[PDB]
Chain A
Amino acid sequence: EVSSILEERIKGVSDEANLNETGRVLAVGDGIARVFGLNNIQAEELVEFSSGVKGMALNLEPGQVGIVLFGSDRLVKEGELVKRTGNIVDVPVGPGLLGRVVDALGNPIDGKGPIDAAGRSRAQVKAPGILPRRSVHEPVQTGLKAVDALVPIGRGQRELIIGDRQTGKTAVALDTILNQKRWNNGSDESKKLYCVYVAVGQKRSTVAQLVQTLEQHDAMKYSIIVAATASEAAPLQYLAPFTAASIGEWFRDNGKHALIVYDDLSKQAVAYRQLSLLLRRPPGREAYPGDVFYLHSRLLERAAKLSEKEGSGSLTALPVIETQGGDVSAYIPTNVISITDGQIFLEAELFYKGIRPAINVGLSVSRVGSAAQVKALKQVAGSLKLFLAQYREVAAFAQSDLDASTKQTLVRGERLTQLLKQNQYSPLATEEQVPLIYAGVNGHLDGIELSRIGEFESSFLSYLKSNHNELLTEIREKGELSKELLASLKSATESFVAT
């Protein structure tokens, strides 16, 4: 009987030692228990209440120590003991958190097994030095024809993921998760990025669905769902990326990398805002915290490509902001823009116009990170980015001449724009991007009509994967565009236009 075994646990615990320091709850309110005492206590140290509500030492004052309650004001009341737990917030780290759906204590809310883990590490840790880093030169592939052309991302770099609500913000990312189906499966450790996905401030149903999405696509077992739920207080919606990060630091310092998928940093800023206005912390820029700057940078400057003085991993850091109806000249996303290099935006225009990924090139500025692109793709993505800069300039002509502007990169324009539209939940490996894109670049989709784009692309891919399987291999595994292609892969493309 289950009760005997549970009763028995409570009995073992029955004999408790001396409390290291004992606070008493003088009053409670604002979600901030005003705990008297705790005379000698570390700053922002975790505490537990003899109730069973844990908090931590957010305000430190001369005669008092405000505790931020993680738990409820229902179960806290005045007098109650507030036992020194002695640790500052640390996190269970390393594997065993893989297959797990977890919270900010890094404890499971899937309910599957115990978290066992090999050691714990601090949740506030500071950035690596200048010289204990090196530049990126290693491709984040994401499994996206489009987005791997425009700006593939550095392994180690922060680049703003922004773009509007439910514009495939939740959707498009499972592609990247499935890309590790190519790489993290495989024994080579510089192709392991453990799938440290996060769900800061998302509802229980959504989260519930999300787990089984990853079980269905079967990437779940090498992923984590570092969740938080919009029902419960600010400390969860605060500590969750830092928790995630510490996970990532373990992998990172061991030469394995973390693919760290920071959804939703807008909830965090809102939680921050809210806690300011709860605890009378004075309303800064636009009434958003003064220090929400420091909060986003404190997290994102952790990210680097390490050299070999601290390991070989990276924190593949993906600062997902989900904008509420645009408004990117608001304080939260202006700050984030500066804290990041280049950018990625998906659009309430395109996505609901029935073109997804919904990307606009202008609002996605290429900068540092497309040097991590492998050669074969870069050779034709450079061309693409010009041709689309043209398609844009050529679309925006009304203030036709029938020339190189107004027909050629209108056609080549429309053509590649349709080519790029992808039904989701598909990884595309690196040799199933360039030969397609390459065809638009030589204008071998100019014969092809706005229907026939995928009939072309799909029959071409089949004809390729029968007679040129070796060339496909060289395109992804040399990572190069070679002279033998500039013959046969181009000859392939040309032969297949008609037939």
Chain B
Amino acid sequence: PITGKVTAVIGAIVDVHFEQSELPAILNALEIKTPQGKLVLEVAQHLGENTVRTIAMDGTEGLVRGEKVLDTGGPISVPVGRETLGRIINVIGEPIDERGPIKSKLRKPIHADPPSFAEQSTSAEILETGIKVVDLLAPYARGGKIGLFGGAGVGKTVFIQELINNIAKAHGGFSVFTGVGERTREGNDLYREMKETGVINLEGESKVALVFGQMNEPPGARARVALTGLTIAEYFRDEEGQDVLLFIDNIFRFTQAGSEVSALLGRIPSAVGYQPTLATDMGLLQERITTTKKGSVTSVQAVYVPADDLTDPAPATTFAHLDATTVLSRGISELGIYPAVDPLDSKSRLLDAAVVGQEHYDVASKVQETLQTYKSLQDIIAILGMDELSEQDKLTVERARKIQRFLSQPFAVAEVFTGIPGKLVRLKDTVASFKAVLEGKYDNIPEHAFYMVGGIEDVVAKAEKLAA
């Protein structure tokens, strides 16, 4: 056997001395018997002569040196199946929703390798979203990273609730929402709402699976929660060919967590207080988001600022890998736009013309252009007077204000919030609707008739009713 007694506890960095000629491998999971259960510590270096140096994942309240250790022989393995959907699971894969033990099918290590060069996104293609705004100005792809911007309460919670609904309708797909630096008090509030709104049902099958980052637990476990979720998504992807959505909260706490563990391992943190392994830690996580031969994960990550700037090492490295931005703004949410997306900072580089179609590109560029001309003229027009308008100008004022209102689409999930039963609007209906406003066939139609409506079909009704 490979067993060894604990011989140090500097920090939460536990050095365990093993029997002569037998020692673990790096990235192994060690199990330590205690009056607290177990501590699952993950080996990150050998010191040699059958000694190791590990990191902690479960908290450390004090440890008697002379405790027995058991080497499992490989990395910590988290459950997979449709028996884990709708249950909050910690880093080692155990319930923290307190509905007590949960069933499982297979267990699979949280470290897996990027898929082959055969099983890649060799072609960008469009993943349809229930939100018309998304589908125009930054349409979603398959094996894509789409980086959400802004904080929490900025329109954040509703954007996330909608997506979980869309995917399921769209294919029959699932989600796993991971939160890193999720506050334990707030996560309860969210879980209670998610249950009410039908994105967590209490059957064995649900939509979204929840994986949460407990800040009262070590830094190693903040960093590894991300990989715990990635693994459940990947099973669905590999063996049932389901398309999934893996959400992250703070990618800020991913970086903070990861640095603390380097610092603890002695690897020099210089270059703006960030770890040297920054590029590769990302590279591993994000190359496991790809299209294979059956399934394709697709990912919404959230960027949250690290010292009131974006020039710092952690944003830049996140950004490089990105392919779209969706830019939720609190100001825009206060004006009662759902989605809260800022329609001039929503961008995609998969908005080419042979990926998205030649037509979809034309509609979308005019939409940007119309609002861009509108906002700039309005600056000095407001002040000087709105009787200083030209014939050219007031066609633009007309088109822009009517488009802006039209952006507000209730969602089924935010039915309570917005006040209207939700809509879902798909790739055909985004082009057709926004196209018509451009040819000004719906400029004889009030603005209270573009409020809380979806694509072209829906808005026919409103024009009649306003008058009635």
A122 proximal to B (CB < 8 A): no
A287 proximal to B (CB < 8 A): yes
Contact among A74, A230, A273 with B25 in the assembled complex (CB-CB below 8 Å): A74
Residue of B whose beta carbon sits closest to that of A170: B349
Residue of B whose beta carbon sits closest to that of A75: B25
The reply to whether B124 and A271 contact each other, CB–CB distance below 8 Å, is: no
A291 proximal to B (CB < 8 A): no
B284 proximal to A (CB < 8 A): yes
Residue of B whose beta carbon sits closest to that of A108: B117
The reply to whether A270 and B279 contact each other, CB–CB distance below 8 Å, is: yes
Residue of B whose beta carbon sits closest to that of A273: B276
Main SS at interface, chain B: loop
A407 proximal to B (CB < 8 A): no
B444 proximal to A (CB < 8 A): no
B114 proximal to A (CB < 8 A): yes
The reply to whether B276 and A205 contact each other, CB–CB distance below 8 Å, is: no
- Looking at A21-29, A183-191, A362-370, A428-436, the stretch in contact with chain B turns out to be A21-29
Q: A26-B48, A203-B286, A204-B290 are in contact. Are A74 and B27 (CB under 8 A)?
A: yes
B320 proximal to A (CB < 8 A): yes
Contact among A74, A203, A273 with B271 in the assembled complex (CB-CB below 8 Å): A273
Complex Cα–Cα for A109 and B47 (A):
35
Main SS at interface, chain A: loop
> Which of B112-162 touch A at CB < 8 Å?
114-115, 117-118, 120-124, 143
Rounded to whole Å, the gap between the CB of A68 and the closest CB of chain B is: 14
> Which of A227-282 touch B at CB < 8 Å?
229-233, 267, 270-271, 273-278, 280
Cβ contacts A310-333/B at 8 Å (1 or 0 each):
000000000000001101000000
Residue of A whose beta carbon sits closest to that of B45: A29
Complex Cα–Cα for A58 and B106 (A):
42
B321 proximal to A (CB < 8 A): yes
Q: A203-B321, A205-B143, A280-B268 are in contact. Are A27 and B311 (CB under 8 A)?
A: no
The reply to whether A287 and B270 contact each other, CB–CB distance below 8 Å, is: yes
> Which of B256-282 touch A at CB < 8 Å?
266-271, 276-280, 282
Cβ contacts B42-60/A at 8 Å (1 or 0 each):
0011111010010000000
A400 proximal to B (CB < 8 A): no
Rounded to whole Å, the gap between the CB of A231 and the closest CB of chain B is: 4
Residues of B within 8 A of A231 (CB): 114, 280, 283-284, 287
B29 proximal to A (CB < 8 A): no
Cβ contacts A272-302/B at 8 Å (1 or 0 each):
0111111010010011000000000000000
Residues of A within 8 A of B50 (CB): 78
The reply to whether B46 and A204 contact each other, CB–CB distance below 8 Å, is: no
The reply to whether A277 and B114 contact each other, CB–CB distance below 8 Å, is: no
Q: A27-B47, A233-B280, A274-B279 are in contact. Are A204 and B270 (CB under 8 A)?
A: no
Residues of A within 8 A of B27 (CB): 73-74
The reply to whether B124 and A209 contact each other, CB–CB distance below 8 Å, is: yes
The reply to whether B282 and A230 contact each other, CB–CB distance below 8 Å, is: yes
Complex Cα–Cα for A207 and B24 (A):
36
Contact among A75, A232, A325 with B316 in the assembled complex (CB-CB below 8 Å): A325
A393 proximal to B (CB < 8 A): no
Complex Cα–Cα for A277 and B25 (A):
23
Q: A204-B287, A205-B120, A325-B311 are in contact. Are A77 and B23 (CB under 8 A)?
A: yes
Residues of B within 8 A of A325 (CB): 310-311, 316
Range for the number of chain A residues in contact with chain B: 35 or more
Contact among B45, B121, B276 with A209 in the assembled complex (CB-CB below 8 Å): B121
B26 proximal to A (CB < 8 A): yes
The reply to whether B26 and A212 contact each other, CB–CB distance below 8 Å, is: no
The reply to whether A232 and B122 contact each other, CB–CB distance below 8 Å, is: no
Q: A109-B117, A204-B117, A230-B287 are in contact. Are A324 and B25 (CB under 8 A)?
A: no
Complex Cα–Cα for A205 and B123 (A):
9
Complex Cα–Cα for A29 and B25 (A):
11
Residues of A within 8 A of B290 (CB): 204-205
The reply to whether A278 and B46 contact each other, CB–CB distance below 8 Å, is: no
Residue of A whose beta carbon sits closest to that of B269: A277
Contact among A27, A101, A283 with B48 in the assembled complex (CB-CB below 8 Å): A27
A110 proximal to B (CB < 8 A): yes
The reply to whether A209 and B123 contact each other, CB–CB distance below 8 Å, is: yes
The reply to whether A229 and B267 contact each other, CB–CB distance below 8 Å, is: no
Complex Cα–Cα for A274 and B363 (A):
45
With contacts A77-B26, A101-B117, A208-B120 known, what are 9 further pairs, Cβ within 8 A?
A26-B48, A29-B53, A205-B290, A211-B122, A230-B287, A271-B279, A275-B276, A277-B270, A277-B271
User: Chain B residues in contact with chain A, CB under 8 A?
Assistant: 21, 23-27, 44-48, 50, 53, 114-115, 117-118, 120-124, 143, 266-271, 276-280, 282-284, 286-287, 290-291, 310-311, 316, 319-321, 349
A-B contact pairs, 17 of them (CB 8 A): A29-B26, A30-B267, A73-B27, A77-B24, A78-B46, A111-B118, A204-B290, A208-B122, A211-B122, A230-B283, A274-B278, A275-B276, A277-B268, A277-B269, A280-B268, A286-B271, A287-B271
